[PDB]
Amino acid sequence: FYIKVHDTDNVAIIVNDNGLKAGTRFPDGLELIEHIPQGHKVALLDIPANGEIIRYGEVIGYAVRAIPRGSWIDESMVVLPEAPPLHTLPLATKVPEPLPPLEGYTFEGYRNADGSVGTKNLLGITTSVHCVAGVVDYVVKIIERDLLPKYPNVDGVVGLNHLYPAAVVPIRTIHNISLNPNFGGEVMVIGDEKHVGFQSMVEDILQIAERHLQKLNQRQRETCPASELVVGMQCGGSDAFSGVTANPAVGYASDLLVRCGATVMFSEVTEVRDAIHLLTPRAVNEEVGKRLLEEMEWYDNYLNANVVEKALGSIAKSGKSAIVEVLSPGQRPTKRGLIYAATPASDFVCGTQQVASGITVQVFTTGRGTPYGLMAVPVIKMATRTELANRWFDLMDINAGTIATGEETIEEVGWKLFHFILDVASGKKKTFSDQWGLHNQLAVFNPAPVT
Amino acid sequence: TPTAFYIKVHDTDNVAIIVNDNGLKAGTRFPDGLELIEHIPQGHKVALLDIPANGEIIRYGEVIGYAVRAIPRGSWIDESMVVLPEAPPLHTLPLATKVPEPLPPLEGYTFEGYRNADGSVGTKNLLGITTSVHCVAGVVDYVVKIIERDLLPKYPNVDGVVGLNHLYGCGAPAAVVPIRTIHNISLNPNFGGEVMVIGKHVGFQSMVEDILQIAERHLQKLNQRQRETCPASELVVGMQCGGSDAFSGVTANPAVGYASDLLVRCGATVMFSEVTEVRDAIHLLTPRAVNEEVGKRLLEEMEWYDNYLNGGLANVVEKALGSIAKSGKSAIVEVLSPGQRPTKRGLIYAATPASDFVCGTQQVASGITVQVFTTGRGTPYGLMAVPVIKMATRTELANRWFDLMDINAGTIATGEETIEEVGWKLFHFILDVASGKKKTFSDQWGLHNQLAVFNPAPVT
Ligand SMILES: [Ca+2]
Ligand SMILES: [Ca+2]
Ligand SMILES: [Ca+2]
Ligand SMILES: [Ca+2]
Ligand SMILES: [Ca+2]
Ligand SMILES: [Cl-]
Ligand SMILES: [Cl-]
Ligand SMILES: [Cl-]
Ligand SMILES: [Cl-]
């Protein structure tokens, strides 16, 4: 088997483990001239010198010399196309017609006083930026082992720590995380007498904390429309199958959520940067397009195989819907649909920033056995290959590798993911991250220098 | 107390600080014969003599500014009445122009510590867990949490377990600081020179079970280690400031500087950091360098940080003079870059950010086994890697946070104790903490915040 993503492609990827040896033939009639490993590209037709190399329906490079059919195309046989300037990129030149809406889909969630719906019932603890740091982590640890077990309806407790002139990103991120629907309607804020005492201070905090736990323990889930979901998507260990299996499937589920009237988010500026010329045309208008370019140059400025090919594989998670809004690190959306939330690719930082943007569910695609997870929101981990789903059967919540062998289609895995999202949001199924407690501490993005 | 007091740091000073809570009202007289003309709050400066216009303002024996207008004696000097002196260029600062004569050595001082195979001595018996930079991250934090609740309780002689995480994506141009820092932390003596390295299908739960068996083998071996009498020369003490206070440089800092000189005399290694806190006073550290190469190396770290950073305003030069007071009077024998380890013994300058958790993490990487943390605020700062001795600047603070302040230096402001007395009291407190005879409040309540490696490179 070989996988051809788009119809106009002139190259394909080998899926067979160990690759395919010379002599192997395919239905169309071509034949390999040499051995080609799995994940590497093969020429479908004879491509001439300086000839375009097409994959994902776009130019990923040019041939350095004439490449014969059925030959292995290595990174040394291609010339990368230099990315064009940002002021020359087309904006809103091809906004697709909205697909027919999906109505009636629901999930059991926790309705908040502000109208938002949480997928989890958590206790949030924070402190004013002018108070001392270290009290929140100490109190959260005591609440987890001494009180949390007495309130089973409470999914957990999360500490929101501030960092110790231009550092607006970290402050905005911590304040917006406390507005996430999984915290409900009230996060806890902790901050004359000759002898006060530290132990005394903590005793008072634990009394306030037990009052909140008793109230959260009495909350119940109610049937809510799928339009109240906010789903975030990010990549973990980039793989040769990421853009041909998991990513396209996530993009199909992304389009289904947009049709339900929900909010989907894709981030990672470093992962989509070399393909921004394919996102700008999908902006609903120019102000949203220029706002998209503004985030690209901000990150290029902050930073002081085929990168274009990998970027095309990442944007596959965005699906085909229109980009209705662009967010800066830690901002919250004001519109519903496909949103672009600028964030670093670094897994724990991306997750923390998406949680700040208000996601209630996160989908994490990966080609490596990573124990990534968050307590703030349930993390659905999708494998890119079947070999990976079998090796880490207790980490991979869903397998997209069935697309590479033709056993399942992008549409089938996409719908399977959509239904998995509603079941996780309803608490009917627990992701492996929530089953084993794979929760890594929040990592706020701090682009400002440390004093 | 109806006894009015002011604290004059150096003999040549023409200004002092009011110590009485609520300050001193006009009419109050002092032994020398001075008298206040107006009310002056605590922490604020008072003129000891009539200072003329453009006249020098001296504190800590150095010029902190010039008077905007003629200042009469016994008057309150606010930050709007002084003009900061333009700082001179770094290439024009004198190097090794005044290296003090080495003081007579202190012999016989010891502490009960854990001798390592490399010759170092630890003050704590910890389990270090790390992973190769090419492996996936998140496994160490998960395993450490399971070891703390399921195995650690079975091995009481083990003080605790610490996870050492690398950077998300790496192999370099500027990302040498975080790699060097994580590698040097595993060489810290409190890990005993034996950190754990972790990195039909098996599955994730199965992988962890194997790691817990390797972890239980290490805990059983560490649980059998015992402390041995070691010379105080094997100590490595780090010093940093927390909540800057008006008394920091007149009480706790000078006392820490006296204990710093005692440790140097014992043949131990002392460290002071925080580039942002000492930057506006570098012209007083450069002359104490043992030689020019160490002096230019000191200026090199100042400009590296300046480059990296590219009545509501206190005097920055005045605050900096108060911070360098922790360095004492010994000679600076070596300068380190963020996360480097020393090759010489004595007073060392380890460049690090002032940010409390990052400074601590970087000093632990440099090899400190004990840290002294001065502060004027009730902070719950602490580290698991090394015991943290928290020193209060005011007696009012030591009483308000009696379960956080390990030692009180506020007795200097009221004249009940001297810099020398509090300095020796700190030195003996350090030996007792290093021996495990006394437990700091940070280790008693478990005020341990996760390590925060300094990452000056942008995150992708
Ligand atoms: Ca990522
Ligand atoms: Ca099928
Ligand atoms: Ca500090
Ligand atoms: Ca006395
Ligand atoms: Ca205790
Ligand atoms: Cl020299
Ligand atoms: Cl040096
Ligand atoms: Cl080094
Ligand atoms: Cl004594």
mmCIF file of C-alpha atoms in Angstrom, chain B residues 5-261:
data_model
loop_
_atom_site.group_PDB
_atom_site.id
_atom_site.type_symbol
_atom_site.label_atom_id
_atom_site.label_comp_id
_atom_site.label_asym_id
_atom_site.label_seq_id
_atom_site.Cartn_x
_atom_site.Cartn_y
_atom_site.Cartn_z
ATOM 1 C CA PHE B 5 16.825 54.751 67.255
ATOM 2 C CA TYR B 6 18.365 55.365 63.785
ATOM 3 C CA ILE B 7 20.840 53.025 61.998
ATOM 4 C CA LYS B 8 23.990 54.491 60.327
ATOM 5 C CA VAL B 9 25.674 51.739 58.211
ATOM 6 C CA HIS B 10 29.100 53.342 57.477
ATOM 7 C CA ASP B 11 31.120 55.895 59.575
ATOM 8 C CA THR B 12 31.372 58.487 56.703
ATOM 9 C CA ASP B 13 27.557 58.410 56.063
ATOM 10 C CA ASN B 14 25.548 61.690 56.329
ATOM 11 C CA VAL B 15 22.134 59.865 56.325
ATOM 12 C CA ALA B 16 20.570 57.133 58.548
ATOM 13 C CA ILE B 17 17.335 55.021 58.641
ATOM 14 C CA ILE B 18 14.546 55.324 61.298
ATOM 15 C CA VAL B 19 13.801 51.910 62.968
ATOM 16 C CA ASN B 20 10.899 52.721 65.408
ATOM 17 C CA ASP B 21 7.550 51.348 64.087
ATOM 18 C CA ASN B 22 5.182 54.266 63.171
ATOM 19 C CA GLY B 23 8.402 56.367 62.781
ATOM 20 C CA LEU B 24 9.610 59.256 65.013
ATOM 21 C CA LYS B 25 7.693 62.562 65.542
ATOM 22 C CA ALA B 26 9.341 66.037 65.433
ATOM 23 C CA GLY B 27 11.197 67.028 68.650
ATOM 24 C CA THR B 28 12.727 63.546 69.182
ATOM 25 C CA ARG B 29 16.443 63.915 70.117
ATOM 26 C CA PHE B 30 19.324 61.378 69.840
ATOM 27 C CA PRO B 31 22.514 60.739 71.912
ATOM 28 C CA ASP B 32 24.934 62.499 69.449
ATOM 29 C CA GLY B 33 22.768 65.689 69.777
ATOM 30 C CA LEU B 34 20.711 65.671 66.517
ATOM 31 C CA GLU B 35 16.929 66.480 66.561
ATOM 32 C CA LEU B 36 14.208 65.781 63.919
ATOM 33 C CA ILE B 37 12.472 68.898 62.440
ATOM 34 C CA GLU B 38 9.497 66.842 61.085
ATOM 35 C CA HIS B 39 7.891 63.355 61.359
ATOM 36 C CA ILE B 40 9.889 60.618 59.515
ATOM 37 C CA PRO B 41 8.382 57.125 58.864
ATOM 38 C CA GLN B 42 10.360 53.891 59.521
ATOM 39 C CA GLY B 43 12.707 52.815 56.673
ATOM 40 C CA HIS B 44 13.030 56.401 55.362
ATOM 41 C CA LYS B 45 16.342 58.365 55.490
ATOM 42 C CA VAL B 46 17.107 61.337 57.846
ATOM 43 C CA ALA B 47 19.892 63.938 57.298
ATOM 44 C CA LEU B 48 22.583 63.739 60.066
ATOM 45 C CA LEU B 49 24.182 67.067 58.937
ATOM 46 C CA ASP B 50 23.164 70.172 56.901
ATOM 47 C CA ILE B 51 23.773 69.081 53.243
ATOM 48 C CA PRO B 52 24.245 71.846 50.604
ATOM 49 C CA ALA B 53 22.725 71.982 47.061
ATOM 50 C CA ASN B 54 24.310 69.418 44.646
ATOM 51 C CA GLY B 55 25.952 68.064 47.852
ATOM 52 C CA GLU B 56 26.911 64.348 48.010
ATOM 53 C CA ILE B 57 24.427 61.936 49.726
ATOM 54 C CA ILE B 58 26.568 59.184 51.381
ATOM 55 C CA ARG B 59 25.205 55.795 52.594
ATOM 56 C CA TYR B 60 27.152 52.466 52.919
ATOM 57 C CA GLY B 61 30.296 54.662 52.558
ATOM 58 C CA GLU B 62 29.491 55.450 48.876
ATOM 59 C CA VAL B 63 27.724 58.281 46.935
ATOM 60 C CA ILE B 64 24.042 57.250 46.378
ATOM 61 C CA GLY B 65 23.116 60.632 44.790
ATOM 62 C CA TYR B 66 23.166 64.472 45.072
ATOM 63 C CA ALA B 67 20.734 66.869 46.840
ATOM 64 C CA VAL B 68 18.277 68.705 44.476
ATOM 65 C CA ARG B 69 18.086 71.553 47.071
ATOM 66 C CA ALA B 70 19.832 72.392 50.403
ATOM 67 C CA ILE B 71 18.663 69.700 52.934
ATOM 68 C CA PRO B 72 18.622 70.820 56.619
ATOM 69 C CA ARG B 73 19.655 68.403 59.444
ATOM 70 C CA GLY B 74 17.012 66.086 60.999
ATOM 71 C CA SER B 75 14.853 66.354 57.831
ATOM 72 C CA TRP B 76 13.130 63.501 55.896
ATOM 73 C CA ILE B 77 14.997 62.759 52.596
ATOM 74 C CA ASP B 78 12.450 61.343 50.060
ATOM 75 C CA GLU B 79 13.461 59.815 46.654
ATOM 76 C CA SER B 80 12.386 63.158 45.015
ATOM 77 C CA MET B 81 15.104 65.104 46.879
ATOM 78 C CA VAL B 82 17.998 63.051 45.470
ATOM 79 C CA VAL B 83 19.470 62.905 41.892
ATOM 80 C CA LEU B 84 20.913 59.490 40.844
ATOM 81 C CA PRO B 85 24.594 59.672 39.744
ATOM 82 C CA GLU B 86 25.077 58.576 36.074
ATOM 83 C CA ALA B 87 26.651 55.063 36.167
ATOM 84 C CA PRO B 88 30.172 54.915 34.624
ATOM 85 C CA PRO B 89 30.870 52.583 31.632
ATOM 86 C CA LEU B 90 31.877 48.944 32.458
ATOM 87 C CA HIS B 91 35.254 49.091 30.582
ATOM 88 C CA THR B 92 36.309 51.991 32.929
ATOM 89 C CA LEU B 93 35.688 50.136 36.255
ATOM 90 C CA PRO B 94 38.811 49.286 38.341
ATOM 91 C CA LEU B 95 39.642 45.520 38.579
ATOM 92 C CA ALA B 96 41.419 43.925 41.623
ATOM 93 C CA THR B 97 42.431 47.437 42.858
ATOM 94 C CA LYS B 98 41.686 46.466 46.517
ATOM 95 C CA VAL B 99 41.917 42.703 47.304
ATOM 96 C CA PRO B 100 41.723 42.362 51.139
ATOM 97 C CA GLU B 101 44.374 40.378 53.093
ATOM 98 C CA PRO B 102 43.087 36.803 53.757
ATOM 99 C CA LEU B 103 41.740 36.607 57.367
ATOM 100 C CA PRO B 104 43.120 33.990 59.834
ATOM 101 C CA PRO B 105 41.478 30.584 59.109
ATOM 102 C CA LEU B 106 38.846 28.901 61.388
ATOM 103 C CA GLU B 107 39.720 25.248 62.170
ATOM 104 C CA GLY B 108 37.803 22.453 63.992
ATOM 105 C CA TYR B 109 34.286 23.356 62.731
ATOM 106 C CA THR B 110 32.417 20.289 61.379
ATOM 107 C CA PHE B 111 28.913 19.048 60.367
ATOM 108 C CA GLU B 112 27.356 15.559 59.965
ATOM 109 C CA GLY B 113 27.053 14.993 56.173
ATOM 110 C CA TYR B 114 26.796 12.181 53.546
ATOM 111 C CA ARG B 115 30.232 11.587 51.886
ATOM 112 C CA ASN B 116 29.941 10.826 48.109
ATOM 113 C CA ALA B 117 32.221 8.786 45.804
ATOM 114 C CA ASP B 118 33.432 12.048 44.101
ATOM 115 C CA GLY B 119 34.563 13.548 47.474
ATOM 116 C CA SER B 120 31.637 16.020 47.816
ATOM 117 C CA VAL B 121 29.469 16.023 51.003
ATOM 118 C CA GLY B 122 25.655 16.250 50.892
ATOM 119 C CA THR B 123 23.421 17.886 53.535
ATOM 120 C CA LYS B 124 20.420 15.744 52.412
ATOM 121 C CA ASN B 125 19.885 12.156 51.116
ATOM 122 C CA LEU B 126 17.689 12.558 47.967
ATOM 123 C CA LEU B 127 16.656 10.372 44.998
ATOM 124 C CA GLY B 128 17.255 12.123 41.642
ATOM 125 C CA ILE B 129 15.259 11.001 38.560
ATOM 126 C CA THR B 130 16.027 12.314 35.040
ATOM 127 C CA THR B 131 15.752 11.212 31.369
ATOM 128 C CA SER B 132 17.820 11.584 28.144
ATOM 129 C CA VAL B 133 16.989 14.796 26.156
ATOM 130 C CA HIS B 134 15.989 12.546 23.158
ATOM 131 C CA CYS B 135 13.166 10.786 25.151
ATOM 132 C CA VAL B 136 9.527 12.040 25.564
ATOM 133 C CA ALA B 137 8.883 14.389 28.558
ATOM 134 C CA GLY B 138 6.249 13.915 31.316
ATOM 135 C CA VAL B 139 7.330 10.388 32.426
ATOM 136 C CA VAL B 140 9.604 11.743 35.244
ATOM 137 C CA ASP B 141 6.876 13.897 36.921
ATOM 138 C CA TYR B 142 4.393 10.957 36.766
ATOM 139 C CA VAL B 143 6.890 8.393 38.258
ATOM 140 C CA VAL B 144 8.164 10.849 40.965
ATOM 141 C CA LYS B 145 4.558 11.417 42.200
ATOM 142 C CA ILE B 146 3.933 7.609 42.439
ATOM 143 C CA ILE B 147 7.308 7.064 44.247
ATOM 144 C CA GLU B 148 6.469 9.834 46.799
ATOM 145 C CA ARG B 149 3.177 8.243 47.974
ATOM 146 C CA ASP B 150 3.848 4.468 47.441
ATOM 147 C CA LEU B 151 7.617 3.932 48.165
ATOM 148 C CA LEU B 152 9.189 6.992 49.931
ATOM 149 C CA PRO B 153 7.220 6.330 53.206
ATOM 150 C CA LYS B 154 8.896 2.841 53.432
ATOM 151 C CA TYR B 155 12.415 4.495 53.385
ATOM 152 C CA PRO B 156 12.448 7.167 56.150
ATOM 153 C CA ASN B 157 16.247 7.874 55.897
ATOM 154 C CA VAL B 158 15.571 9.236 52.345
ATOM 155 C CA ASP B 159 14.747 12.964 52.609
ATOM 156 C CA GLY B 160 12.799 12.984 49.334
ATOM 157 C CA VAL B 161 12.697 12.465 45.524
ATOM 158 C CA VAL B 162 13.314 15.206 42.890
ATOM 159 C CA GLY B 163 12.459 15.047 39.155
ATOM 160 C CA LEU B 164 14.907 16.706 36.679
ATOM 161 C CA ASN B 165 13.038 17.524 33.400
ATOM 162 C CA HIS B 166 14.820 18.632 30.145
ATOM 163 C CA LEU B 167 13.469 20.989 27.418
ATOM 164 C CA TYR B 168 10.523 19.836 25.202
ATOM 165 C CA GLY B 169 12.334 20.041 21.802
ATOM 166 C CA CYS B 170 16.180 19.965 21.525
ATOM 167 C CA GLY B 171 19.046 17.856 20.063
ATOM 168 C CA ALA B 172 21.504 24.886 20.666
ATOM 169 C CA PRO B 173 22.679 28.420 19.606
ATOM 170 C CA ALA B 174 21.481 29.939 22.955
ATOM 171 C CA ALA B 175 19.865 26.844 24.596
ATOM 172 C CA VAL B 176 23.192 25.787 26.312
ATOM 173 C CA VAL B 177 22.060 27.315 29.696
ATOM 174 C CA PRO B 178 19.118 24.869 30.335
ATOM 175 C CA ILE B 179 21.084 21.705 29.260
ATOM 176 C CA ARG B 180 24.182 22.629 31.369
ATOM 177 C CA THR B 181 21.850 23.460 34.331
ATOM 178 C CA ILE B 182 20.018 20.046 34.269
ATOM 179 C CA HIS B 183 23.309 18.087 33.915
ATOM 180 C CA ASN B 184 25.018 19.995 36.804
ATOM 181 C CA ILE B 185 21.941 19.567 39.111
ATOM 182 C CA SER B 186 22.452 15.750 38.870
ATOM 183 C CA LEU B 187 26.074 16.369 40.124
ATOM 184 C CA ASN B 188 24.767 18.195 43.251
ATOM 185 C CA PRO B 189 26.051 16.361 46.380
ATOM 186 C CA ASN B 190 22.499 15.965 47.853
ATOM 187 C CA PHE B 191 21.791 13.336 45.110
ATOM 188 C CA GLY B 192 24.709 11.149 46.327
ATOM 189 C CA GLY B 193 26.245 10.926 42.815
ATOM 190 C CA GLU B 194 23.662 8.264 41.763
ATOM 191 C CA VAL B 195 20.682 9.829 39.883
ATOM 192 C CA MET B 196 18.271 7.486 38.105
ATOM 193 C CA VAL B 197 18.029 7.756 34.319
ATOM 194 C CA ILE B 198 14.710 6.484 32.813
ATOM 195 C CA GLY B 199 13.926 6.289 29.056
ATOM 196 C CA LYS B 200 2.898 -9.238 22.424
ATOM 197 C CA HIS B 201 3.230 -5.576 23.637
ATOM 198 C CA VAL B 202 4.441 -4.058 26.970
ATOM 199 C CA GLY B 203 2.285 -0.913 27.449
ATOM 200 C CA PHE B 204 2.675 2.247 29.594
ATOM 201 C CA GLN B 205 1.595 0.793 33.009
ATOM 202 C CA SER B 206 4.105 -2.101 32.504
ATOM 203 C CA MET B 207 6.927 0.344 31.719
ATOM 204 C CA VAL B 208 6.212 2.284 34.935
ATOM 205 C CA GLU B 209 6.138 -0.950 37.055
ATOM 206 C CA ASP B 210 9.721 -1.719 35.825
ATOM 207 C CA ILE B 211 10.820 1.881 36.690
ATOM 208 C CA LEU B 212 9.293 1.513 40.221
ATOM 209 C CA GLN B 213 11.381 -1.703 40.725
ATOM 210 C CA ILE B 214 14.592 0.173 39.694
ATOM 211 C CA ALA B 215 13.456 3.053 41.982
ATOM 212 C CA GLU B 216 12.876 0.730 44.982
ATOM 213 C CA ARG B 217 16.410 -0.724 44.493
ATOM 214 C CA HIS B 218 17.897 2.841 44.706
ATOM 215 C CA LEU B 219 15.734 3.795 47.748
ATOM 216 C CA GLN B 220 16.830 0.609 49.649
ATOM 217 C CA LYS B 221 20.509 1.575 49.065
ATOM 218 C CA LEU B 222 20.031 5.316 49.963
ATOM 219 C CA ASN B 223 18.011 4.330 53.106
ATOM 220 C CA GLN B 224 21.192 2.596 54.462
ATOM 221 C CA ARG B 225 23.461 5.687 54.138
ATOM 222 C CA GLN B 226 24.595 7.419 57.391
ATOM 223 C CA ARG B 227 26.057 10.903 58.058
ATOM 224 C CA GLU B 228 29.786 11.214 58.967
ATOM 225 C CA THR B 229 31.647 14.070 60.722
ATOM 226 C CA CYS B 230 33.041 16.253 57.838
ATOM 227 C CA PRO B 231 35.034 19.538 57.979
ATOM 228 C CA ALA B 232 32.951 22.738 57.410
ATOM 229 C CA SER B 233 35.210 23.303 54.324
ATOM 230 C CA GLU B 234 32.990 20.774 52.433
ATOM 231 C CA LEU B 235 29.927 23.107 52.709
ATOM 232 C CA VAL B 236 28.715 25.100 49.630
ATOM 233 C CA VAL B 237 26.365 27.919 50.779
ATOM 234 C CA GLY B 238 24.257 30.123 48.464
ATOM 235 C CA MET B 239 22.677 33.449 49.417
ATOM 236 C CA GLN B 240 19.800 35.340 47.787
ATOM 237 C CA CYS B 241 17.239 38.079 48.690
ATOM 238 C CA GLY B 242 13.428 37.695 48.575
ATOM 239 C CA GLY B 243 11.204 40.697 49.369
ATOM 240 C CA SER B 244 13.525 43.767 49.258
ATOM 241 C CA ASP B 245 13.040 45.739 52.537
ATOM 242 C CA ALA B 246 14.277 49.120 53.895
ATOM 243 C CA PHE B 247 16.183 47.101 56.588
ATOM 244 C CA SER B 248 17.582 44.377 54.259
ATOM 245 C CA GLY B 249 21.003 46.110 53.853
ATOM 246 C CA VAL B 250 21.275 47.275 57.513
ATOM 247 C CA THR B 251 20.291 43.998 59.314
ATOM 248 C CA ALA B 252 20.029 40.581 57.532
ATOM 249 C CA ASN B 253 22.379 41.317 54.562
ATOM 250 C CA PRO B 254 25.386 42.518 56.672
ATOM 251 C CA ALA B 255 24.833 39.538 59.060
ATOM 252 C CA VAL B 256 24.788 37.119 56.052
ATOM 253 C CA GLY B 257 28.002 38.831 54.831
ATOM 254 C CA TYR B 258 29.688 38.194 58.200
ATOM 255 C CA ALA B 259 28.636 34.499 58.141
ATOM 256 C CA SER B 260 29.862 34.479 54.493
ATOM 257 C CA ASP B 261 33.366 35.594 55.653
#
